[PDB]
Every structure is written in C-alpha cells, then in structure tokens.
A paper describes a structure:
The third variable (V3) loop on the human immunodeficiency virus 1 (HIV-1) envelope glycoprotein trimer is indispensable for virus cell entry. Upon CD4 receptor engagement, the Env trimer relaxes the conformational shielding to expose the coreceptor binding site including the protruding flexible V3 for interaction with either C-C chemokine receptor type 5 (CCR5) or C-X-C chemokine receptor type 4 (CXCR4) coreceptors. DARPins are small binding proteins (14–18 kDa) designed based on a consensus derived from naturally occurring ankyrin repeats. Broadly neutralizing DARPins (bnDs) bound V3 solely on open envelope and recognized a four-turn amphipathic α-helix in the carboxy-terminal half of V3 (amino acids 314–324), which we termed ‘αV3C’.
Crystals of bnD.8 and bnD.9 in complex with linear BF520 and BG505 V3 peptides diffracted to a resolution of 1.22 Å and 1.17 Å, respectively, enabling a detailed analysis of the DARPin–V3 interface and definition of contact residues. Strikingly, in both the crystal structures and the cryo-EM structure, V3 formed a distinct, highly similar secondary structure when complexed with the bnDs: a four-turn α-helix extending from residues G314 to I323. In both the complex with bnD.8 and the complex with bnD.9, one face of the α-helix, including the 312GPG314 turn, was buried in the DARPin binding groove. The DARPins interacted, via their variable, randomized repeat regions, with αV3C. The binding interface accessed by DARPins comprised residues bridging almost the entire C-terminal half of V3. Both bnD.8 and bnD.9 binding are facilitated by several hydrogen bonds with most relevant sites shared; for both DARPins, T320V3 interacted with DARPin residues D67 and N/R69 (bnD.8/9), and G314V3 bonded with DARPin residue D104. Bonds between D321V3 and A316V3 with DARPins W46/R80 and S102, respectively, are unique in bnD.8, whereas Y318V3 with K113 and I323V3 with Y13 are unique to bnD.9. T320 forms two hydrogen bonds with bnD.8 and bnD.9 that seem to be critical for bnD docking, as identified escape mutations fail to form hydrogen bonds with the DARPins. Two escape sites, A316 and I323, are buried deep in the hydrophobic interface, rendering replacement by bulkier residues prone to disruption of the contact surface.
Author numbering:
A (entry chain A): 3 to 160
B (entry chain B): 309 to 330
C-alpha cells in the first residue's frame, strides 16, 4: 500500500519517491505495526530534505512509536544535528519521555552528541530529567565517558 | 539484536526494529 512504500522511501532517502507518493495521496502519518511513521524513519536515517518535505506536508512532529520514541529522540540519539534543529523549529517536544523515561537530552548525552546536547539545552531541555533507572543526562554522559557533554550539563545545571 | 537493558532501552528497542526494515 502507499503507506508501506512511503515508510520505505523515507528510511531509504528516496526524496523523489516521497514526493510522488504524497502526490498520489499517501498518508504522511502512515504508521506501521510498531507505531513508526515516515518522519521517524527519515529522522533516524538522517534524511534532512525528506524530514522537511514531510513536515511541510503535515507530518506529526511529536508522533511516538510503541516505545514512546519521537522523531526528536531518534535524531538526537543518531547524531542528526540539522534534523534536531528542524524538528524543534516545527514544535518537537524537547522534553518528551520514551518508555524508559529517557528524553532527547538523555539519548544525545548517552550517544555522545555534544552539539545536539547544546541545541537541546538552548530549546529548554530539562537538565534535571531522571529516567526510570534514576539517571539524569549528566549521569549518562559520565557513565559513557562523554566528559565534554558532562561538563556542559554541569554548567547548565548551575 | 542483543537486548540492551537500562538507560536507552526504549531507544535501542526502536533502533533495532528500524534496523529490520531499513
């Protein structure tokens, strides 16, 4: 169906096909069994032009999958800085919790993406956020030996 | 396809699912 092809086009970077499918009436918010939408998959794989096209054509920036994961979580975790910026400009919830209680800031701190941590903090990320395992983003930075991120989070918390 | 427990668990779960259809 058109929704399956759009999910495939979005994860595979098929800019032209994404536009063809949405012209042929594909649902921009098509969700698979797992709650994943085209915007999740484009945000995950770093397809900036597709993220922009999907947002322009009504994609839900705050869509969550079965694990509470939002496009912003995926872009923050996967190190896609320009996508993080575009998703926040479109109204992404900077402090969304997934089903582990992790925020985008937790996942950027864990995965070692320092400029993404700085942009999240600039857009109101909650430095004190605790996941369900009792960890703050600072704790995950420390745990993962991300000393630059730990230093920036300690300053933000002051 | 190994099961990562604790912080990042939700992320790793979704990251693995996306890895299937990728």
């Amino acid at each position: 169906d058109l929704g399956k092809k759009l999910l495939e086009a979005a994860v595979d970077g098929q800019d032209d096909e994404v536009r063809i499918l949405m012209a042929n009436g594909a649902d921009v918010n098509a969700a698979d069994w797992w709650g994943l939408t085209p915007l999740h998959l484009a945000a995950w794989h770093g397809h900036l032009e597709i993220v922009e096209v999907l947002l322009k054509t009504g994609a839900d920036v705050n869509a969550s999958d079965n694990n509470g994961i939002t496009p912003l979580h995926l872009a923050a975790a996967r190190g896609h800085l320009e996508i993080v910026e575009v998703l926040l400009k479109a109204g992404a919830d900077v402090n969304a919790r997934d089903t582990s209680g992790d925020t985008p800031l937790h996942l950027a701190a864990m995965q070692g993406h320092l400029e993404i941590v700085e942009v999240l903090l600039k857009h109101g990320a909650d430095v004190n956020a605790q996941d369900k395992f009792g960890k703050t983003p600072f704790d995950l930075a420390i745990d993962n030996g991300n000393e630059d991120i730990a230093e920036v989070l300690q300053k933000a918390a002051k | 396809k190994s099961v990562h427990l604790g912080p990042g668990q939700a992320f790793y779960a979704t990251d693995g699912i996306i890895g299937e259809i990728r």
